[PDB]
Amino acid sequence: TMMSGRPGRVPLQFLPNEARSLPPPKLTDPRLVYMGFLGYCSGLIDNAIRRRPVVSAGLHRQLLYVTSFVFFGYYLLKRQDYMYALRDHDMFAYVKSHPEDFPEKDKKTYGEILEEFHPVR
């Protein structure tokens, strides 16, 4: 799946207009919570490296780290969801337009299929 040359793709556009047709990630998305947790860990490591009280040195700095991580994570999640939606859209369209390559196989039940039996002895 190389979508770099996919037709009608604006060159440097992070989120196209059609991506607005998709449900946005919820603010309590577990991935957003993990991005906030990553920002919190960055704040703790920042306090530790500068030889400051790790948990309670700069509350404004830790808040800024968490907020920036959540902001970027929200936009990244939107782009990720949009790209997966494009992949599924293209796959379904291709299967629809090429019926001879994706045939409808015959329904067979197990009572009329012979599988070899291998005893465990």
Partner 1 sequence: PFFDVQKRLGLDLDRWMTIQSAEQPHKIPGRCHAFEKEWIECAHGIGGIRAEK
Partner 2 sequence: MLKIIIPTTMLLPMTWMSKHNMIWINATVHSLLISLISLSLLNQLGENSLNFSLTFFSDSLSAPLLVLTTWLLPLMLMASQSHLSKETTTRKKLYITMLILLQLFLIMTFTATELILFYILFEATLVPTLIIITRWGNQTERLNAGLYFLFYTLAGSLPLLVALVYIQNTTGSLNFLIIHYWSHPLSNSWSNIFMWLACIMAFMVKMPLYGLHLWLPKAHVEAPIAGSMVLAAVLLKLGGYGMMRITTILNPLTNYMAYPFLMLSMWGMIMTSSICLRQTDLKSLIAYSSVSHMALVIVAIMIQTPWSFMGATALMIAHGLTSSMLFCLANTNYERVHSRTMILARGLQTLLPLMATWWLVASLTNLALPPSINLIGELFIITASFSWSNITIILMGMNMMITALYSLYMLITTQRGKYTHHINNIKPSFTRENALMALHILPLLLLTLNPKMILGPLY
Partner 3 sequence: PPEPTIRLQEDPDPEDENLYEKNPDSHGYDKDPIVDLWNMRVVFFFGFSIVLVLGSTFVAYLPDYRMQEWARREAERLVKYREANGLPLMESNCFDPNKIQLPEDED
Ligand X SMILES: CCCCCCCCCCCCCCCCCC(=O)OC[C@H](COP(=O)([O-])OCC(O)COP(=O)([O-])OC[C@@H](COC(=O)CCCCCCCCCCCCCCCCC)OC(=O)CCCCCCCCCCCCCCCCC)OC(=O)CCCCCCCCCCCCCCCCC
The site for ligand X (CB under 6 A) is made up of 41, 44-45, 48, 53-55
Min dist CB 113 to partner 2, Å, is 12
CA distance 84 to 113: 37
Angle between helices 59-97 and 30-49 (to 10 degrees): 140
Q: Does 11 bind ligand PLX (CB under 6 A)?
A: yes
Contact present, 12 and 6 (Cβ < 8 Å) = no
CA distance 65 to 68: 5
Residues 10-29, one symbol each (x = binds partner 1 by CB under 8 A, - = not), give xxxx----------------
Nearer to partner 1, 11 or 103 (CB): 11
Q: Which does 53 bind (CB under 5 to 8 A by kind): ligand X, partner 3, partner 1, none?
A: ligand X
